[PDB]
Amino acid sequence: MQGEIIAGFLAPHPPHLVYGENPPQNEPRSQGGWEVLRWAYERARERLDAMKPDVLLVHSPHWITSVGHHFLGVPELSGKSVDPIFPNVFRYDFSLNVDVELAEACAEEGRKAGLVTKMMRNPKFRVDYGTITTLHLIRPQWDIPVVGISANNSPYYLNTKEGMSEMDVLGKATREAIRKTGRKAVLLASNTLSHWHFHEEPTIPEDMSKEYPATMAGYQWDIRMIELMRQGKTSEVFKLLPQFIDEAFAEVKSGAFTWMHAAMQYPELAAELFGYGTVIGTGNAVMEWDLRKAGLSML
């Protein structure tokens, strides 16, 4: 029994995307919206479905922890996730299953590697909208088990270099957890790109004629990066990441992007873009690194 990282996805989590889908889980009704980005997630969904993985791992920017890197560790988590910022578009009754055994192995491996880790064992925990969203966009069936990983404070509290380094160790430790347990895992970096934005929410949110990049430079930064990604110039994006953070205010600062690539071992493999698009001016890219097809998925 040997472990596998089938693939890693860049899977952004703007709640408007689920709002646009009008699923049974989400309370508010929409007239559609962000169909380009949703059609990107159509190609994500079927690429995942043809993988049949044991577990999805997801690192979310919206479960911020100060003391170490936390892991979901309760067999069944249920609840009503209302987003504090966008409660008008996102109020979602979730019901998910956690791969507690793998979560614990990641935590133990992280602990072993020098990081401080904790298992989230509280049955009443309210799962963040980033985790709920990314997952529902790539797999609305709600069937594959999940490991929810918190985003540690380090990149904001210490600085970007130290935070990224912590996030890298977490990635390496995640790899080790997958291999020691022989899991068939898919990694999910729940990160958006350029976050420099406008403060104007249209009267009716889905109005796509009011949707566009917030700054020209934001878009240009997003393009340069994802163009390097589909080129397979992985080392070069990670050389440019600090500057990309600083000038585009990109959410990959939270850490999931570094975490995912560290877990795959920074593969010089060209990525497949399912689509770029903006939500409230933010840069959002749905991408995949197919490790199985590149034959780097065996641990």
Binding site: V67, G68, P84, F86, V116, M120, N122, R126, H199, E201
Partner: protein
């Protein structure tokens, strides 16, 4: 109209685990601030918490009654946080309408199961507030807002309370120095992270006691940067703006640690 003023910690550790002596003291001091709150006989409680994060525009809690069980995303091992919180819907909705006139885009927030932040909950539980006797007008901490804007927001609400002829108790919820320990410690040996953080807290806490608004005003931006103060001390700007930049003295009922962080309970002498 403002009949009472307080600053209290937004950390849940005093409520969740009062068996730790220092935290026990913090809890006892927040409870004692609750008696002082009640005795001032307010009709509404103007609450601001550092943990109520908004990004788009100013959010005011408009939901008549909010209840549920909150689990802190950081301190979920020490227990749950049940809450039952009433809101002055007339004041809040007025604050929403008054807001864009003062240059701040605002929207009311009324949704079932809307997450009320840990700070607001712990201060309700410990101070005995947010009941039908003392409903709340909670304003969000917008991340893009400055202390200037926060002061303008608190003032705007006092003025909205004036033309509804109501007595206001002001509570700013948040911590002092924010050097949280980055590894798990024995809670019994929790102390303030540094002595630099300690000296800074002691100092600015003494300026609050003496009521030197002017010396406080200039120490604030330096203190906030040098001690990593919880959200740039905007939960004090709230209290200043509510009292329109004027107060006599102040009373410090508690000061202790919260996982390396500074926490304090302050009763304000108007």
């Amino acid at each position: 109209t403002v009949v009472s003023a307080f600053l209290v910690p937004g950390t849940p550790l005093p409520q969740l685990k009062p068996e730790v002596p220092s935290w026990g003291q913090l809890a006892a001091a927040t409870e004692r601030a609750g008696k002082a709150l009640a005795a001032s006989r307010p009709d509404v409680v103007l609450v601001y918490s550092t943990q109520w994060l908004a990004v788009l525009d100013q959010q005011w809690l408009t939901r008549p009654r909010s209840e549920g069980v909150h689990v802190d995303e950081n301190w979920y091992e020490f227990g749950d946080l049940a809450y039952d919180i009433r809101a002055d819907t007339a004041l809040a909705e007025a604050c929403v309408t008054s807001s864009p006139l003062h240059g701040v885009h605002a929207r009311g927030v009324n949704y079932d199961g809307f997450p009320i932040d840990t700070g607001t909950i712990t201060a309700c539980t410990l101070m005995g507030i947010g009941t039908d006797a003392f409903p709340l007008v909670v304003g969000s901490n917008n991340l893009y807002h400055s202390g200037e804007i926060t002061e303008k927001l608190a003032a705007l609400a006092v003025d909205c309370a004036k033309d509804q002829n109501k007595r206001v108790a002001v509570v700013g919820v948040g911590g002092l120095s924010g050097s949280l320990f980055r590894e798990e410690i024995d809670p019994r040996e929790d102390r303030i992270a540094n002595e630099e953080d300690d000296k800074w807290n002691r100092r600015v806490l003494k300026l609050i006691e003496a009521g030197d608004v002017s010396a406080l005003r200039e120490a604030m931006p330096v203190y906030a940067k040098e001690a990593r103060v919880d959200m740039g001390f905007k939960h004090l700007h709230w209290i200043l703006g509510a009292l329109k930049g004027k107060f006599s003295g102040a009373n410090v009922l508690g000061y202790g640690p919260s996982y390396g962080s500074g926490a304090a309970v302050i009763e304000f002498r108007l």
